[PDB]
Design a protein around this motif. Structure first.
Motif, PDB file in Angstrom:
ATOM      1  N   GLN A  15       0.830  -1.194   0.000  1.00 28.15           N
ATOM      2  CA  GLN A  15       0.000   0.000   0.000  1.00 28.15           C
ATOM      3  C   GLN A  15       0.864   1.244   0.000  1.00 28.15           C
ATOM      4  O   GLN A  15       0.538   2.229  -0.658  1.00 28.15           O
ATOM      5  CB  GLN A  15      -0.909   0.006   1.223  1.00 28.15           C
ATOM      6  N   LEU A  16       1.964   1.197   0.744  1.00 27.12           N
ATOM      7  CA  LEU A  16       2.869   2.330   0.806  1.00 27.12           C
ATOM      8  C   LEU A  16       3.469   2.568  -0.574  1.00 27.12           C
ATOM      9  O   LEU A  16       3.561   3.706  -1.034  1.00 27.12           O
ATOM     10  CB  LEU A  16       3.989   2.081   1.820  1.00 27.12           C
TER      11      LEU A  16
ATOM     12  N   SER B  88       0.651   4.152  -2.904  1.00 31.03           N
ATOM     13  CA  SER B  88       0.371   5.554  -2.653  1.00 31.03           C
ATOM     14  C   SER B  88       1.575   6.430  -2.975  1.00 31.03           C
ATOM     15  O   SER B  88       1.419   7.566  -3.419  1.00 31.03           O
ATOM     16  CB  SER B  88      -0.090   5.771  -1.201  1.00 31.03           C
TER      17      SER B  88
ATOM     18  N   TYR C  13       1.683   6.902  -6.882  1.00 30.25           N
ATOM     19  CA  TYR C  13       0.614   7.755  -7.391  1.00 30.25           C
ATOM     20  C   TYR C  13       0.813   9.216  -7.040  1.00 30.25           C
ATOM     21  O   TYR C  13       0.231  10.100  -7.663  1.00 30.25           O
ATOM     22  CB  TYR C  13      -0.741   7.308  -6.843  1.00 30.25           C
TER      23      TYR C  13
ATOM     24  N   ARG D  49       1.800  11.012  -9.928  1.00 30.80           N
ATOM     25  CA  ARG D  49       0.951  10.657 -11.069  1.00 30.80           C
ATOM     26  C   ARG D  49       1.270  11.376 -12.377  1.00 30.80           C
ATOM     27  O   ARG D  49       1.199  10.774 -13.446  1.00 30.80           O
ATOM     28  CB  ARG D  49      -0.530  10.875 -10.724  1.00 30.80           C
TER      29      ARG D  49
ATOM     30  N   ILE E 102       2.457   4.037 -12.114  1.00 31.32           N
ATOM     31  CA  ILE E 102       1.696   4.987 -11.312  1.00 31.32           C
ATOM     32  C   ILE E 102       0.989   4.361 -10.103  1.00 31.32           C
ATOM     33  O   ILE E 102       0.023   4.904  -9.580  1.00 31.32           O
ATOM     34  CB  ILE E 102       0.670   5.806 -12.164  1.00 31.32           C
ATOM     35  N   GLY E 103       1.471   3.208  -9.658  1.00 32.69           N
ATOM     36  CA  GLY E 103       0.889   2.592  -8.477  1.00 32.69           C
ATOM     37  C   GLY E 103      -0.277   1.619  -8.545  1.00 32.69           C
ATOM     38  O   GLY E 103      -0.724   1.137  -7.507  1.00 32.69           O
ATOM     39  N   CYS E 104      -0.787   1.312  -9.728  1.00 35.01           N
ATOM     40  CA  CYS E 104      -1.897   0.376  -9.794  1.00 35.01           C
ATOM     41  C   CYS E 104      -1.455  -0.981  -9.279  1.00 35.01           C
ATOM     42  O   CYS E 104      -0.585  -1.625  -9.874  1.00 35.01           O
ATOM     43  CB  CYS E 104      -2.398   0.222 -11.222  1.00 35.01           C
TER      44      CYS E 104
ATOM     45  N   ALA F 134      -6.745   2.022 -14.598  1.00 37.17           N
ATOM     46  CA  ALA F 134      -6.934   1.345 -13.317  1.00 37.17           C
ATOM     47  C   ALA F 134      -6.428   2.102 -12.089  1.00 37.17           C
ATOM     48  O   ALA F 134      -7.110   2.132 -11.056  1.00 37.17           O
ATOM     49  CB  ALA F 134      -6.291  -0.032 -13.370  1.00 37.17           C
ATOM     50  N   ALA F 135      -5.234   2.691 -12.181  1.00 38.10           N
ATOM     51  CA  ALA F 135      -4.681   3.438 -11.051  1.00 38.10           C
ATOM     52  C   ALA F 135      -5.564   4.646 -10.739  1.00 38.10           C
ATOM     53  O   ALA F 135      -5.730   5.025  -9.580  1.00 38.10           O
ATOM     54  CB  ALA F 135      -3.274   3.893 -11.361  1.00 38.10           C
ATOM     55  N   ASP F 136      -6.145   5.235 -11.780  1.00 38.92           N
ATOM     56  CA  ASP F 136      -7.004   6.395 -11.620  1.00 38.92           C
ATOM     57  C   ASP F 136      -8.370   6.064 -11.050  1.00 38.92           C
ATOM     58  O   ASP F 136      -8.895   6.807 -10.221  1.00 38.92           O
ATOM     59  CB  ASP F 136      -7.151   7.110 -12.955  1.00 38.92           C
TER      60      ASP F 136
ATOM     61  N   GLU G  79      -8.993   3.578  -9.150  1.00 43.12           N
ATOM     62  CA  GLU G  79      -8.748   3.178  -7.776  1.00 43.12           C
ATOM     63  C   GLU G  79      -8.515   4.397  -6.893  1.00 43.12           C
ATOM     64  O   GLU G  79      -9.098   4.534  -5.824  1.00 43.12           O
ATOM     65  CB  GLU G  79      -7.521   2.270  -7.703  1.00 43.12           C
ATOM     66  N   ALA G  80      -7.649   5.282  -7.357  1.00 43.67           N
ATOM     67  CA  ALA G  80      -7.298   6.485  -6.621  1.00 43.67           C
ATOM     68  C   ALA G  80      -8.440   7.470  -6.426  1.00 43.67           C
ATOM     69  O   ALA G  80      -8.708   7.915  -5.314  1.00 43.67           O
ATOM     70  CB  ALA G  80      -6.136   7.182  -7.317  1.00 43.67           C
TER      71      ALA G  80
ATOM     72  N   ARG H  94      -4.722   7.174   4.034  1.00 44.69           N
ATOM     73  CA  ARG H  94      -4.390   7.539   2.664  1.00 44.69           C
ATOM     74  C   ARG H  94      -2.982   7.159   2.210  1.00 44.69           C
ATOM     75  O   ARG H  94      -2.654   7.283   1.029  1.00 44.69           O
ATOM     76  CB  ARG H  94      -4.619   9.031   2.462  1.00 44.69           C
ATOM     77  N   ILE H  95      -2.160   6.688   3.143  1.00 44.50           N
ATOM     78  CA  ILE H  95      -0.797   6.269   2.830  1.00 44.50           C
ATOM     79  C   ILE H  95      -0.687   4.756   2.878  1.00 44.50           C
ATOM     80  O   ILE H  95      -0.262   4.133   1.905  1.00 44.50           O
ATOM     81  CB  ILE H  95       0.230   6.798   3.842  1.00 44.50           C
ATOM     82  N   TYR H  96      -1.080   4.176   4.018  1.00 43.55           N
ATOM     83  CA  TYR H  96      -0.999   2.731   4.253  1.00 43.55           C
ATOM     84  C   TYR H  96      -2.266   1.922   3.974  1.00 43.55           C
ATOM     85  O   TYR H  96      -2.256   0.698   4.080  1.00 43.55           O
ATOM     86  CB  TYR H  96      -0.559   2.473   5.689  1.00 43.55           C
ATOM     87  N   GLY H  97      -3.359   2.586   3.631  1.00 45.21           N
ATOM     88  CA  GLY H  97      -4.578   1.851   3.335  1.00 45.21           C
ATOM     89  C   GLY H  97      -5.315   1.230   4.511  1.00 45.21           C
ATOM     90  O   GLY H  97      -6.258   0.461   4.324  1.00 45.21           O
TER      91      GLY H  97
END
Lengths: 244, 233, 204, 244, 222, 198, 250, 243, 196
Positions: free
Chosen positions: C88-89, C92, C95, C98, C126-128, E49-51, E53-54, G99-102
């Motif tokens: 998760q880190l 985020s 992104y 981005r 980009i983090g997906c 997908a990243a968008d 999700e975000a 928002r960082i670690y979910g």
């Protein structure tokens, strides 16, 4: 205007002293005592939790001993909250250094940084100083084991053994009386406990009112290890040294 | 009383006064005298210059803002520099953007508004200087009196500074006389030099002691010093 | 041209029986020119492993960044970050850039120290987050790696077997990619120990 | 204790803002001015003390116009009045630019209100040393308003402020009774010139100059205009006549 | 990607396939395109997908905070207004295409949001590369007043149209039902019509096949 | 482009850098020193864009000297190179990036071992036995791959270079006007002022 | 205009005291009593709903607030300050962690954040310390259940049980007697109801009392189903009814 | 020392005098107001005291229309009342824009209360000397009354009153409810609920009212409005015949 | 897209088709291009759906705050607000808006805001890609002060021709009647208008 209510925290007294700094120091002097003793093979940080209760959780706590780096730690004396603000910026500074040079931050560079931050609140901003004093215990491959101290003024110095908080005068005299250059870590662990035991403003010196930590370079390894003694380990080390 | 309400301009006294402003007005009276009078064709400024030693020069008191406007000062010189300079720009602006000469009545409005801003906010001090503004615009000759309080007034003539009340009476009495000195500038200038000496006391207006400025129908605001004013001494 | 094809390199992670493996090549080039045969792309913060393929400078930068973040994470939480959390880190963190992304293809491998369950994940620049229970691929030879993995792989392989599988998947893809190779290294991870083996492959 | 009257936003023990009140004193100390709402417009008049024969007559205009349909007159510190109008002018231009239709008098009132009230919130500013009477004609009627340094304001049938504020208010109250159905524009102009002459008694020592302006849907087309020449003299006399 | 939304007599249902691609290559054979904004407002997302999700989590987070602040249930129109004003700000650069549905103190709702910030309302909607295959099915079998099971069938069928006919879509079908009175029920992998036939052989290698040059133990503990 | 070669032998690091400075159609100078001394035991050579090249080196030099004075200590070659990478990695995503490639060679007085670092303008750092920037590698890497040995003496190293420089003077299209060589070892930095005919 | 107050309003006095913090603590002293008890499988926090008119609706004012689905808080002191603090807390939980670690932050860390916010109001320019003390209770996978107290100075400490406010001294004493490291949630809910009885003067029912706990996961309070790892919030505010049922066996 | 009474910092007793003095300011207008809840409406009554004859009675009000659904009555000086009204109007406008639905009465109250709490902590902002009562028929909570003060405190009421004679009105109302045993006026038409309001207003105050002594605001499903001199007169007449 | 607003004897009527396309694909066939900014102030949207919607939402915001302070706004004011947005941001918008409202003092009014951002008050206005085809028909059949049924017919025929020729237009014809009587919603399906 607003000038009316401005304390002017950053002005000189006719004697050339900083009112707020001197008063902050006066504050620190009522905080639990913290001892820092440097041996030939390690460093010992000991602290007395000022005031407690039967319900106060001693296991889920660490109110005066904080880990800054993997090789540096500090003992706090004063406002816990103020201390946490400084500690955190200090933890950040250590990491930036690591990311920049790919080497752990030398102990003095980290201490000077924090002191400079404190010094700032002394010369501008019109804000009150941080009512905190630190004893820094750390290691690095240039000076090995080091012990430092920084106060509200923003000044810092190095020691073989030092104390901050209440009854520092009494404690510094006792330390300056039984300390010896060749001392070994376990000797120091004992000197520390004895010193606090003689300056405490309490009846006995039980384990629930203490915090202990040692930066020893465990012979069986080749590197440095930080160990913040757990409630039990403090209870043990308290019986051995003969204070039951 | 006063003691507790004259710390800064943002404070009103219980009676409803603004002491800092009144103190500013004070620096004006302590300043050297200057006079202003106009007809229907010209407007004149006569001022008494002051000096420190006998080895020092006499501080100029007449400043030209544009070709059709200028003023005389009484009080803090620096503030007149600031104000005349702000007025110089306002005139220059009007010329550049609208290709129009700034109405004297409007110059006064700008000064009033700039001065007022300094009497309502913390930290600033009121201007410590009085100004007399003359000018020939699209509606004839004009004369204005500026007070640091932000009060500007249009007159036929007037004077400000020490003993200024002498000239002010002479003029208030000589009214019907000079108000008709049209077509002839030398008469207005003489009448001015007279009204001003009504406020003398120490010495007599010398050559490097007097200062006269004029503007009118066909006279672009010009300044006279020394030998240039000899024929009026 | 394509920041992801300047330096070259591949990484692949696989899950076995109570274990996970993550391997990568050792090449770092500048277009056709080989520059280093010692550029490893697998890093670890505690027991969590991260592989980064893409633009070398960013691979290096991200490693320094995550080291920095996991270090502070440990100081506050007083526990080492877990695979799922780290994932998760990473997401985020990626992104956050981005509109000016790091040109990398991260891969996370580790075993949840509390549940002993194996874990692997992959993300795009980009983090997906791309979650799989079998394998994850990344790098200039990602098609070949998908080719191998998709065929060679089978569930619950044992450490000594998963190693063979992962190694053959990596080795044969790197050989069909001009920008990959010049050495390889495999990591066999278990709830307690981690073995690191350097494989033998062609050097052309 | 005391000192509640030194800062512009302090609440005294009784709930007042002394500075705002001291501000009022500056208003009462000023020249008197008035406003008379008629059946289809409004009339504004003010006293102009003639300090000497040096003041060019008809030249130091005090009444001001906002946009094209608003009239503003005030008593107290003149510079502050201008500052408040300059603001109102911007406030009105802004409204027209966005909504096209020229600003409604009620809407315009609140703008000045909010702005003035604002100068009683912070101690870093001073309150306005003026009371302002303003109004005009709009989409639905004529409106007359008076605004205090406190930021307080209301709609009026007739209004006055300054030194002769009591005389005026008295005259106005009569008119309000002896004209239940409403006065007329032409009428209010005369009636106004009168009330000023009368109210000039509380300052009878100095000679003055009269100033009238009006905004009538019929007499001026809804546009604010200054009463000059003949119509002016006709009202001057109507006054000089009933002044004896 | 094939995502759809269908309204029924007492609620709304949304479904989506599970194929995530990169060019002509399948990145994730089973990714979830159904996002939770709040317990009873769910979102289906196509595009980047990243968008999806975000943008979905950001609004979800703010919605949770807004909910706590107002002590009220989140409304689908609030997630819609927040989503679109955000997407609009970024002038389409945040490639998110969403089908947002849910129930709240005001009824059941179904909306769609395009990357540029425009929104549409309807009883049935679809988005993604499978968009047309699905819509062809919806235009053929939809009718007013569907039952909860009729809707789940129509939705499930529309996603299939995409899985089969569109190359950008494939694998499984995920559904999420939101009914006016009950809890939202998320059905991950409601359908799995694409399971891999057993390989034709095992490629397990005889240990020792791979040549090793060096070996060592890795240090994990501090 | 320019020639920037570096080779790490037994107890020292050798840096060879071309002397030519060509601006358009003419060769303006034939004795340019494309290097800076970051500290008593650390040397950095560089090649790239016209202005960025020297500006970057002098900026890096200044910072290292400041660190040395503030701390009365000399950063390890590894530390200096990590610092320099970070600087390049920062400028790569800035408004106008420094287009500079560098070789950092130093002698780690604390480990008593010479070290050679190669970093390109993107902030790509790698530690090597021998390295080069630009086209230099294309002609020399085959020679170095062959004759290079970790235990070579500073003398064997200077001979391996000499060989490299000759292959360059033969097959490369540009006249780089020879090179300037420098040695970094336990005793500091010295210049082999006789390679023009060694 | 503009905050010309860019200097500290809390400064050190010759004795070494920080006046504004002392005074803020005095404000907390006059506040209604609140308390928290930690059992071995839960935590309970409670306070008294001191209505300011029988015309006021006591439900439209909670003194016990949920910070995250596993963390709750209660206070003593100035209600408004508490309110804005709760908002800032719920938000920092997201911006600085979820928002960082979910995932939501662990109790100690969120407390640490709250504490920071209060510290700044102790040194920043132009403000006064918050006039409240909070008792935050929560649970996190790697630390279990915990209870903390955050004071105006920004200091915070963990407790097994404690009380703050009006009769904190009396209550703290009553707790030491009845507490042990083997209590079950229900036992603590009981001890809580008793300790609180001494503090409340007037009516003592499920409408004059506010009590919430941090216990097991409430899958029925999740709002949806379909995700195995999402079992529900551990924070649950007791209902007026649930209170009275225990008030009997009191 | 003596300045802890001028700005909003604590006094040795942990008090904030400036907030207490602001409360004083709320009674400066000497006006009383009360609000009650119907079965499906909310009514607010407030004394209208127009002293000066020169005043245009129609421009003298302490009741504002915040939004299509929210109504707010203010107890305190008019400039601070208008400042508060403008802010609330802006807040309700923006809330709608950003979230897609009308701002609830209780939420707008919390928002205004929070804004007031700020002046309580920051030294350059003075508290507003007013008490705000918000009313509407929330779409989720039905008839609603929420009030905020200079201390930044707020809560919902079954009915409430504010002003110098606040206590007389309150106890009067308290008693009516201890009796009826329900938390609202059991009526269908708002006209009757308005009448109830004006009646108990008279009982507690012990004064008779004309059609220019009151000011009425009514909140109903999807709309809040204020009665005119005549709409009121009609209400006065109705209660007249029965007494 | 085909949209129009016509002022008649009792007030004003707004009409539109219901088709929004992205290329040749019909993304929405039941679109509501008739947007409400105030009780009796509505608008017809042509151009970027994203842009016009965002513009409409902001305008509705401004009119709601205008009402909170100054009561009901004039139809001219609403148009002014639309113009302010459209003109000041012409470089980033592709919006063609027709503003139509009903005032009791002004009866019915229609303002057209084309691409540039300029405003034009007219008896009636047409816009949208399909409008081009009915310029002739409309100029020949518009009469001032028609009846409600006369107008609803003028609009029904015009749009039916527009929908006929322009592939960007289609679906159902929607209308909104704005009179003192209130606000009326009309709809007309294919089978009806395709046969006119």
């Amino acid at each position: 205007g607003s000038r009316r209510y401005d304390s002017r925290t950053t002005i000189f007294s006719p004697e050339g002293r900083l009112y707020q700094v001197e008063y902050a120091l006066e504050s620190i002097s009522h905080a639990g005592t913290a001892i820092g003793i440097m041996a030939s093979d390690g460093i010992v940080l000991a602290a007395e939790r000022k005031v407690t209760s039967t319900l106060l959780e001693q296991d889920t706590s660490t109110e005066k001993l904080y880990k800054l780096n993997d090789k540096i730690a500090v003992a706090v004396a004063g406002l816990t909250a103020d201390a946490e603000i400084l500690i955190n910026t200090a933890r950040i500074h250590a990491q930036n250094y690591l990311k920049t040079y790919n080497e752990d931050i030398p102990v003095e560079i980290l201490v000077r940084r924090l002191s400079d931050i404190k010094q700032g609140y002394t010369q501008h901003g019109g804000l009150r100083p941080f009512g905190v004093s630190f004893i820094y215990a750390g290691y690095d491959d240039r000076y090995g084991y080091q012990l430092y101290t920084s106060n509200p003024s923003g000044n810092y110095t190095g020691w073989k053994a030092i104390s901050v908080g209440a009854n520092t005068s009494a404690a510094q005299t006792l330390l300056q009386m039984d300390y010896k250059d060749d001392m070994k870590v376990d000797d120091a662990i004992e000197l520390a406990l004895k010193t606090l035991s003689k300056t405490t403003d309490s009846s006995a010196l039980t384990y629930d009112r203490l915090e202990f930590a040692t930066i020893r370079k465990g012979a069986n390894d080749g590197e440095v290890y930080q160990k913040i003694f757990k409630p039990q380990e403090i209870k043990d080390i308290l019986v051995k040294t003969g204070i039951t | 009383f006063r003691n507790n309400y004259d710390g800064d301009t943002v404070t009103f006294s219980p009676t409803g006064r603004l002491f800092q402003v009144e103190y500013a007005l004070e620096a004006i009276k302590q300043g050297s005298v200057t006079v202003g009078l106009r007809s229907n064709t010209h407007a004149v400024l006569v001022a008494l210059k002051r000096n420190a030693d006998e080895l020092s020069s006499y501080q100029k008191k007449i400043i030209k803002c544009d070709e059709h406007m200028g003023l005389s000062l009484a009080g803090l010189a620096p503030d007149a520099r600031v104000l005349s300079n702000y007025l110089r720009q306002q005139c220059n602006y009007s010329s550049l953007v609208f290709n129009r000469k700034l109405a004297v009545e409007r110059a006064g409005h700008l000064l009033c508004d700039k001065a007022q801003k300094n009497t309502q906010s913390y930290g600033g001090r009121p201007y410590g200087v009085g100004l007399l503004i003359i000018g020939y615009d699209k509606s004839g000759a004009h004369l204005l009196e500026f007070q640091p309080s932000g009060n500007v007034t249009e007159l036929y003539g007037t004077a400000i500074g020490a003993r200024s009340q002498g000239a002010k009476t002479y003029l208030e009495r000589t009214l019907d006389t000079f108000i008709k000195i049209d077509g002839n500038p030398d008469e207005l200038i003489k009448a001015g030099v007279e009204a001003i000496s009504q406020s003398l006391r120490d010495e007599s207006l010398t050559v490097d002691n007097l200062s006269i400025a004029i503007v009118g129908k066909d006279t672009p605001f010009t300044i006279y010093d020394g030998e240039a004013v000899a024929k009026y001494i | 041209s394509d920041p992801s094809s300047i330096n070259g390199g591949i990484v692949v992670a696989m899950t076995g029986k109570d274990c996970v493996a993550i391997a990568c090549d050792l090449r770092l080039g500048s277009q056709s020119l080989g520059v280093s045969n010692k550029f490893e792309k697998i890093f670890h913060y505690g027991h969590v492993f991260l592989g980064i393929t893409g633009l070398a400078t960013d691979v290096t930068t991200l490693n320094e960044m995550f080291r920095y973040k996991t270090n502070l994470y440990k100081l506050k939480e007083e526990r080492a970050i877990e695979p799922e959390t780290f994932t998760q880190l990473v997401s985020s963190s990626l992104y956050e850039r981005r509109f000016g992304p790091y040109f990398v293809g991260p891969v996370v491998a580790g075993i949840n120290s509390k549940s002993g369950k194996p874990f692997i994940a992959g993300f795009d620049l980009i983090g997906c987050i791309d979650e799989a229970k079998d394998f994850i691929v990344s790098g200039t030879a990602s098609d070949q790696l998908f080719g191998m993995c998709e065929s060679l792989y089978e569930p619950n392989l044992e450490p000594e077997d998963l190693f063979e599988t992962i190694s053959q998947a990596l080795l044969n893809a790197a050989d069909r990619d001009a920008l990959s190779g010049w050495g390889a290294v495999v990591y066999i991870i278990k709830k307690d120990e981690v073995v690191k083996r350097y494989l033998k492959m062609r050097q052309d | 204790g005391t000192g509640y009257d030194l800062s512009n936003s302090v609440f005294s023990p009784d709930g007042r803002n002394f500075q705002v009140e001291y501000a009022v004193k500056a208003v009462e100390n000023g020249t008197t001015s008035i406003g008379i709402k008629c059946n289809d417009g409004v009339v504004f008049a003010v006293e102009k003390l003639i300090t000497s024969k040096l003041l060019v007559p008809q030249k130091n205009v005090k009444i001001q116009v906002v946009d094209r349909h608003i009239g503003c007159v005030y008593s107290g510190l003149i510079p502050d009045g201008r500052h408040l109008v300059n603001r109102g002018r911007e406030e009105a231009a802004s409204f027209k630019k966005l909504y096209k239709t020229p600003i409604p008098i009620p809407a315009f009132a609140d703008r000045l209100g909010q702005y003035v009230q604002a100068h009683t919130l912070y101690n870093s500013v001073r309150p306005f040393g003026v009371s302002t009477i303003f109004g005009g004609v709009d989409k639905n009627g004529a409106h007359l308003y008076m605004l205090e340094p406190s930021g307080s304001y209301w709609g009026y049938k007739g209004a006055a402020t300054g030194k002769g504020r009591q005389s005026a208010k008295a005259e106005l109250e009569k008119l309000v009774d002896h004209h239940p159905e409403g006065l007329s524009a032409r009428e209010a102009v005369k009636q106004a010139a009168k009330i000023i002459y009368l109210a000039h008694e509380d300052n009878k020592e100095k000679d003055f100059e009269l100033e009238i302006s009006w905004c009538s849907l019929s007499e001026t087309n809804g546009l604010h205009k200054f009463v000059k020449g003949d119509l002016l003299q006709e009202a001057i006399d109507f006054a000089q006549k009933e002044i004896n | 990607t094939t995502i759809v939304g269908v309204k029924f007599n007492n609620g709304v249902v949304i479904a989506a396939d599970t194929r995530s691609t990169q060019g002509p290559i399948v990145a994730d054979k089973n990714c979830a395109k159904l996002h939770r904004i709040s317990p009873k407002i769910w979102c289906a997302g196509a595009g980047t997908a990243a968008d999806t999700e975000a943008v979905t989590q950001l609004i979800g987070s703010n919605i949770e905070l807004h909910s706590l602040y107002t002590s009220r249930e989140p409304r689908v129109v609030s997630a819609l207004q927040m989503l679109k004003q955000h997407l609009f700000k970024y002038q389409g650069h945040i490639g998110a295409y969403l089908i947002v549905a849910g129930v709240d103190p005001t009824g059941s709702h179904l909306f769609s949001i395009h990357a540029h910030g425009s929104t549409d309302v309807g009883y049935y909607l679809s988005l993604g590369s499978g968009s047309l295959a699905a819509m062809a099915v919806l235009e053929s079998h939809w009718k007013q007043d569907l039952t909860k099971e009729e809707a789940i069938k129509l939705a499930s069928d529309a996603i299939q149209a995409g899985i089969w006919n569109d190359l950008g879509s494939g694998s499984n079908v995920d559904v999420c039902v939101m009914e006016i009175g009950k809890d939202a029920e998320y059905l991950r992998n409601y359908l799995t019509p694409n399971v891999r036939e057993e390989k034709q052989k095992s490629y397990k290698f005889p240990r020792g096949t791979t040549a090793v040059l060096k070996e060592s133990i890795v240090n994990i503990c501090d | 482009m320019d020639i920037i070669l570096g080779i790490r032998v037994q107890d020292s690091v050798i840096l060879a850098s071309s002397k030519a400075v060509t601006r358009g159609i003419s060769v303006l100078k034939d004795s340019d020193d494309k290097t800076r001394q970051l500290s008593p035991h650390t040397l950095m050579s560089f090649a790239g864009e016209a202005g960025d090249t020297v500006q970057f080196a002098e900026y890096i030099q200044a910072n290292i000297q400041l660190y040395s004075i503030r701390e009365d200590y000399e950063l390890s070659p590894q530390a200096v190179s990590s610092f320099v990478r970070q600087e390049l990695a920062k400028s790569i995503r800035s408004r106008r990036p420094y287009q500079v490639n560098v070789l950092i060679g130093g002698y780690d007085k604390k480990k008593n071992k010479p070290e050679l670092y190669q970093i390109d303008y993107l902030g790509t750092k790698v530690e090597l036995p021998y390295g080069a920037h630009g086209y230099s590698g294309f002609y020399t890497f085959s020679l170095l791959d062959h004759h290079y040995r970790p235990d070579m003496t500073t003398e064997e190293g200077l001979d391996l270079l000499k060989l490299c420089v000759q292959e360059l003077e033969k097959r490369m299209p540009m006249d780089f006007k020879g090179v300037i060589v420098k040695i970094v070892d336990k005793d500091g930095i010295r210049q082999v002022d006789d390679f023009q005919a060694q | 205009m503009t905050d010309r107050y860019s200097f500290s309003l809390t400064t050190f006095s010759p004795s070494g005291k920080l006046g504004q913090i002392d005074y803020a603590l005095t404000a907390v002293k006059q506040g209604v009593t609140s308390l928290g008890i930690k059992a071995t499988n839960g935590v309970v926090i409670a306070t008294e709903k001191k209505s300011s008119s029988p015309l006021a609706m006591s439900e439209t004012l909670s003194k016990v607030s949920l910070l995250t689905p596993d963390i709750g808080a209660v206070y003593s002191g100035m209600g408004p300050d508490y309110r804005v603090l709760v908002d800032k807390s719920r938000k920092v939980a997201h911006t600085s962690y979820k928002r960082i670690y979910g995932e939501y932050p662990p109790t100690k860390l969120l407390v640490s954040e709250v504490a920071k916010i209060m510290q700044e109001a102790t040194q920043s320019g132009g403000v006064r310390p918050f006039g409240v003390s909070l008792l935050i209770a929560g649970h996190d996978e790697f630390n279990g259940f915990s209870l903390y107290q955050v004071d105006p100075s920004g200091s915070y400490f963990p407790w097994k049980a404690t009380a703050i406010g009006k009769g904190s001294v009396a209550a703290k004493t009553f707790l030491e007697k009845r507490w042990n490291d083997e209590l079950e949630l229900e036992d603590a809910i009981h001890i809580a109801l008793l300790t609180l009885k001494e503090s409340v003067e007037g009516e003592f029912n499920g409408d004059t009392i506010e009590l919430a706990i941090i216990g097991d996961e409430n899958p029925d309070l999740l709002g949806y189903t379909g995700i195995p790892t999402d079992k529900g919030p551990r924070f649950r505010k007791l209902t007026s009814q649930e209170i009275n049922d225990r008030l009997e066996a009191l | 020392a003596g300045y802890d009474r001028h700005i909003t910092i604590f006094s040795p007793e942990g008090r904030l005098y400036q907030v207490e003095y602001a409360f004083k300011a709320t009674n400066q207008t000497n006006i009383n107001s009360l609000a009650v809840r119907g079965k499906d409406c909310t009514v607010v009554i407030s004394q209208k005291k127009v002293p000066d004859k020169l005043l245009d009675p129609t421009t003298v009000s302490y009741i504002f229309c915040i939004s299509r659904t929210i109504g707010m009555v203010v107890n305190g000086p008019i400039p601070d009342a208008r400042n508060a009204a403008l802010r609330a109007k802006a807040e309700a406008a923006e809330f709608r824009y950003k979230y897609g639905y009308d701002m609830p009465c209780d939420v707008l109250a919390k928002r205004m209360a929070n804004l007031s709490q700020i002046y309580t902590q920051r030294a350059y902002m003075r508290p507003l000397g007013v008490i705000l009562t918000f009313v509407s028929v929330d779409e989720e909570l039905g008839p609603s009354i929420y009030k905020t003060d200079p201390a930044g405190y707020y809560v919902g009421y079954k009915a409430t009153a504010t002003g110098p004679k606040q206590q007389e009105i309150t106890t009067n109302l308290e008693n009516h409810f201890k009796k009826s045993k329900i938390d609202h006026i059991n009526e269908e038409s708002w006209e009757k609920v308005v009448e109830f309001a004006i009646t108990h207003m008279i009982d507690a105050l012990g004064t008779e009212f004309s059609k220019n002594d009151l000011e009425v605001g009514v909140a109903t499903k999807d709309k809040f409005f204020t009665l005119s001199a005549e709409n009121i007169e009609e209400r006065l007449v109705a209660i007249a015949e029965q007494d | 897209t085909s949209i129009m607003a016509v002022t008649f004897k009792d007030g004003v009527i707004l009409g539109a088709d219901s088709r929004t396309t992205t290329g040749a694909y019909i993304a929405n066939r039941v679109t509501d291009k008739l947007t409400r900014v105030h009780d009796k102030i509505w608008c017809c949207r042509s151009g970027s759906a994203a842009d016009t919607q965002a513009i409409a939402d902001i305008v509705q915001y401004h009119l709601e705050l205008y009402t909170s302070q100054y009561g009901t706004p004039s139809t001219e004011t609403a148009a002014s607000v639309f113009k302010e947005l459209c003109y000041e941001n012409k470089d980033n918008l592709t919006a063609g808006i027709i503003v139509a409202g009903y005032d009791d003092k002004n009866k019915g009014e229609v303002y057209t805001i084309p691409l540039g951002g300029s405003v034009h008050k007219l008896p009636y206005a047409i816009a949208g890609s399909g409008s081009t085809f009915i310029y002739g028909y409309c100029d020949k059949n518009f009469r001032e002060n028609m009846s409600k049924e006369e107008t609803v017919d003028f609009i029904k025929h015009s749009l039916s021709q527009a929908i006929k020729w322009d592939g960007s237009s289609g679906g159902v014809i929607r209308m909104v009647v704005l009179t003192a009587a209130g606000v009326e919603r009309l709809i007309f399906y294919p089978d009806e208008y395709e046969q006119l």
